[PDB]
Amino acid sequence: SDLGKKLLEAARAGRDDEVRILMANGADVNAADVVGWTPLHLAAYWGHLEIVEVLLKNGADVNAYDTLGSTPLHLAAHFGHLEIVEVLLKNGADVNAKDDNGITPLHLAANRGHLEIVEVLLKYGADVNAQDKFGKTAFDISINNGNEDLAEILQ
Amino acid sequence: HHHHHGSDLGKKLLEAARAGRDDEVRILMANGADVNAADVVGWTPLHLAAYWGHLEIVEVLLKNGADVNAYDTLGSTPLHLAAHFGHLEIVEVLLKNGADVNAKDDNGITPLHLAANRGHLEIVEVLLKYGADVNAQDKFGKTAFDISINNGNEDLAEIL
Amino acid sequence: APPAVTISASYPGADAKTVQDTVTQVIEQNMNGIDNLMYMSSNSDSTGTVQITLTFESGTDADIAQVQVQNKLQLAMPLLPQEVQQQGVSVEKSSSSFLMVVGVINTDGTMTQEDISDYVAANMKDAISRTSGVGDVQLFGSQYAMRIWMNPNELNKFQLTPVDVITAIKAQNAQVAAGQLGGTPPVKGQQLNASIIAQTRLTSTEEFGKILLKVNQDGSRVLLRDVAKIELGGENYDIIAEFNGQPASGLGIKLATGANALDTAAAIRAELAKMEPFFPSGLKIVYPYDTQGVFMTMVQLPAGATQERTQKVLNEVTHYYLTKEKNNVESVFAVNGFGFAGRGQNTGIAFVSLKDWADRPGEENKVEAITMRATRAFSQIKDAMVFAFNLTGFDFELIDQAGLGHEKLTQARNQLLAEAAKHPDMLTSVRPNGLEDTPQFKIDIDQEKAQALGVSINDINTTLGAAWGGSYVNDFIDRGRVKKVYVMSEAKYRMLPDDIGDWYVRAADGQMVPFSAFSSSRWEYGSPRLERYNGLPSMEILGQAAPGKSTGEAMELMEQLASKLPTGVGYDWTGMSY
Amino acid sequence: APPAVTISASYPGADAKTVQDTVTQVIEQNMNGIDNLMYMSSNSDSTGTVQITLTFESGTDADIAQVQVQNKLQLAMPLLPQEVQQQGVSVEKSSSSFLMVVGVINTDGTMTQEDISDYVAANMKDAISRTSGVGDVQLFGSQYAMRIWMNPNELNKFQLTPVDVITAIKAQNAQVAAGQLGGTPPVKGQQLNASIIAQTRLTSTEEFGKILLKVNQDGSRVLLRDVAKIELGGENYDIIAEFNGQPASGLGIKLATGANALDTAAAIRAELAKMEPFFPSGLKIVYPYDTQGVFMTMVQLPAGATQERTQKVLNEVTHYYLTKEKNNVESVFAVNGFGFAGRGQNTGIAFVSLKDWADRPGEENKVEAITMRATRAFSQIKDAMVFAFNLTGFDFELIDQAGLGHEKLTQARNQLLAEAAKHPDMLTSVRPNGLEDTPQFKIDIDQEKAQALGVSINDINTTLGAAWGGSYVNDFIDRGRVKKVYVMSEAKYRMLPDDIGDWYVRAADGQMVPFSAFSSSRWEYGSPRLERYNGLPSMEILGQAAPGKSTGEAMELMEQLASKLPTGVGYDWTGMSY
């Protein structure tokens, strides 16, 4: 869709007023680019909170995944966007979603030491015994990274 | 035999026994300088004079009761240095003053091994004359005869 | 003055002779085809450093001379070892003295001497380097490097050697070119084009710490932090500085030959203004040396002197200006590890800045009298040369003409000095300019025992070299800037001879073999700095004439006692004697 | 005189085409964007030598020309083989004629030709090369190297191969950077600081023989001297010199483009005076050539003529001057293996100095008359181009413009030479300037048999190349000077094609495999010197105009004859015809 492309580039750039007119003009809420990223994906990746909110109100698929299995909750947990992680979980995002590598958002937050996000994820039912394709849990990530603050959160 | 780090007059004696200043070595001894002063590596003034070949200084220190069998931090005696560097007369004065002809350093290397490896054949005879254990072995098991085999020195193999 | 070009190369962890027999001679043997070359001199020190100085005839274009020397060395580059090439060689036209010194201190005290030096190198040196007429920039300190401080007891516990550390760092600190998806030439109908990103160079000690060295047979994993301490630290720890007795770093600014003196200076001051707004809190720029008004103080200790003893002489010099001439001295920038001549653990220099000329009244308080009094006060410091000077004897080179050797040349030098001492009516202060031999630790690898146990020699020489001297592995990115990674033993385990046996090397059958099994050591005397003049081993001798006689007679005499020297010992005049 | 810049590389044991397609073409393809460039020629001969000559317009600043060429050569330096870079690629700007020749003899007969050659290269050549105005120095001989002469019978006896010998020499003739004790950063309070001295480069034949190759399972040692003869010997054995029949050596010195002949010749005599007092007993300097007084005699034999055959032609030339012209000739400096057109086994040169002008009265005793009789006496020497000259024609290049190949350029040259013979009215003595194709040994490695036996290709090519061509390994120290270490078979075992089958290579399973088991051979012809003009394969052709007719008429006929050659063959005029 021509509108869907203008929405993707507007969501990628954080233009909330252009995103609103595109929503009112009937643009595809779930238009995906070549890599499989929806407007919710890029707004979650680039930390545009209200674009994440406006999209979800207009029926955005909170659990859309790209060609490699990554959800908008994955990107938000990876890049320290704490407020976006909460609104995604509140709008029904799968806390235990796995990509093609069996990797969960808890792994991504633990890998980058996003402790505030780790607590919010486990508060919403994140499986802490979740293993990726190599059999590594979030606890193994804390031991390997040497992050002792996280290693006591997970216990 | 393992002497300790000194002070000031001991340093001047160590600095002079190395440079070969005979007049000042005698001056400092008459003023009470420690004849067994050591530097950081454990070399006495006898070590330094035997290394750089100052035969007179070797005799003046021994006159003043210098330790003929002083050990450095690795077990090398003044006889080790003199025999290693082809200083004939010093090896004589040391042995004549009671030097341990069979002294082994930390590696088992004797003055015979050092004189044999550098091809100092005059010194290998003086060492043997004073009762050098010809079958002495280092840590690797090598004798002075094994040195000549490996070096290709057939004059030495004759002597041994 | 005759234009001069200096070549600089470095060999990490190499002694003087290793450096001379691998770098200096190879460079010197290829310095042909250079026009208007008067003579050539070189130094090879136990710091692992060469400086070859080529002096050209008067009126020579310094640009052409540098270009010709630069191009000749480019051809000799493949003849040098890989370690020297990785360090980068420099060819520079410049004067010997500094144009100005830019000091950097930290009032807050949040940055130590080591951090201040890293900031100036990582954020100030390169931009000052590219400024108008600045020929040589000398950092009084060292840029940070990813320092891996190996522990031999832990390495032996996991059957690992520094070879495994260096191998794993090169594998897991890599910048991998991995191509693209949908790249050219592409299949038709392809809609996706994206770059593939594999491994990126590491950026933090945390990343280096989790470098996986090996996994054990029970599943447990050995990380790089399990065998070493991972910290940021300088490429070298040779040079440290102080401004008015407090931690400092800085840049020594030399004027490029032919450049204007002042307009350069203002350009450095201009670029410095561009940097100040983005300094961290507490950082401040001070100007301790600006070329009346300033002078220097040289401090030279004999070879075999540590930084501790050199620092003691520097404190005494700094304490003098700050206490007994505080009415005249504004500031003192003191550097240890760097002298006027060059680098050395036994050398130092202090840049003294005076108060404004108007505030010091009378003959008693001007640079001439202050330097005379200072030199008089420093003259009784024992075992040290301490001189004070702003901004006439002979310069003599003793040449090894027939392959005699270093030891035989030393004896011939002492023979010439002893005979010159017997003519106080003629030549006084006849002295060598270089350094005396010092105790060194000769270690022999037994090849037979190494082969019987199945231990590679390169594994042995890498384990010994990387641990006790340091090893430049590869580069990493520290806050967006390319910096070096260095592998070395922690201080603890490379200080005294008994520690040699603490180091283990793995054999072909997996057995850990201590260094004591295949090595043997002894003390001996070698040189810490080896001089060459016109391609031949040489020893510079300085001196001057007695009261009331012209150097011509002085010089003529020196020629005569050089004739009675042993067979194969030549001589030549250089410097202002030429 | 048009200014010319010459690039010279070396590839030991390499043939003409191997040199052409790994060094010559790589350097040539980057020789564009160079200002005031007229043309460019090159030779790649089976000496393992390439000589690219770049000629510029008159008035071109030779200094600048050199920089530009050198700067474009850097684009190719990483692409050249390692073995070529290790020899040291050189770029120089000089005339092609010799300014003078410095001869060195030993009146006492204490020193062999090889001994005199090594002393000149080690103690004399470098200082002359660095003298201002000296464009190029050609040594009439070669500096000594540590020659390892391998025995293939003894090597096969201990399951060893030249690869093992090479690996042992790099391991045991090593210069190790071993670090320090108490090095910075130290544990605070450290007092002891000493350099660590590990392996040093070997300095004698006795030390190289001590190199342990392996320990047999029963416990005995197999040394390098047990499988090889170790001696000091030249880097190559292709240039021998004689002075009045007695063994000698020397340096051919060409003047740098634009330098003063008188001043540079005087500076060379001043430098020679600095080294005479330190000569060994018997050595003496003689001056057989100084630029009437002098003339040269060029000797050029067919390709494939050995140094033996060339010495006899030189002997007849020297015999002529010493017997029939002894009233006018003072000295004859004969050089075998080096020639006017370069360097090769089939070429030679004689430098002849007449006695004083006063003791040669009469015109028949003048330079032209003496050279006139000399060439007339050398008219009837079989299979030799022998002429003498003091120091009309055209310079023609036949270019392969469509990649026809060397063999088709030969025929196109023969068809042009045949048509030029039928026109004596216009063209006189039209002949090529290069060499004719000679028999060569073409060996084929069966990849399937090698892989089936576990014998690696690198083990094969290193074994064959090092035994039959010699391999430069690393450096060593000979009387305080860095020199090369060469590994080669003893002459005895590299003379006949059956000696190939006596060379063994160890397979992965450990079994020795003879070279006959995986290879085959046949005789074929190939060029011993490949010429290129402006990047493309060429064949230089020279002749002169007939009596009375100008060069433009002869060139016009040559242009017409050349246009009748097959398609793809072009031409161009160079040198004196440009």
Numbering used by the authors:
A (entry chain E): 12 to 166
B (entry chain D): 6 to 165
C (entry chain B), D (entry chain A): 39 to 329, 569 to 668, 678 to 864
Which passages does the manuscript contain on this structure?
Upon antibiotic stress Gram-negative pathogens deploy resistance-nodulation-cell division-type tripartite efflux pumps. These include a H+/drug antiporter module that recognizes structurally diverse substances, including antibiotics. The superfamily of resistance-nodulation-cell division (RND) efflux pumps plays a key role in intrinsic MDR in Gram-negative bacteria.
We obtained crystal co-structures of trimeric AcrBper in the LLT conformation with doxycycline (2.1 Å), fusidic acid (2.3 Å) and levofloxacin (2.7 Å) by soaking pre-grown AcrBper/DARPin crystals in the presence of doxycycline (6.25 mM), fusidic acid (5 mM) or levofloxacin (5 mM), respectively. Like rhodamine 6G, levofloxacin interacts mainly with the hydrophobic side chains of F178, F610 and F628. Largely planar, heterocyclic compounds including doxycycline and levofloxacin fit into the DBP groove and upper cave region, interacting efficiently with polar side chains and hydrophobic residues of the Phe-rich area.
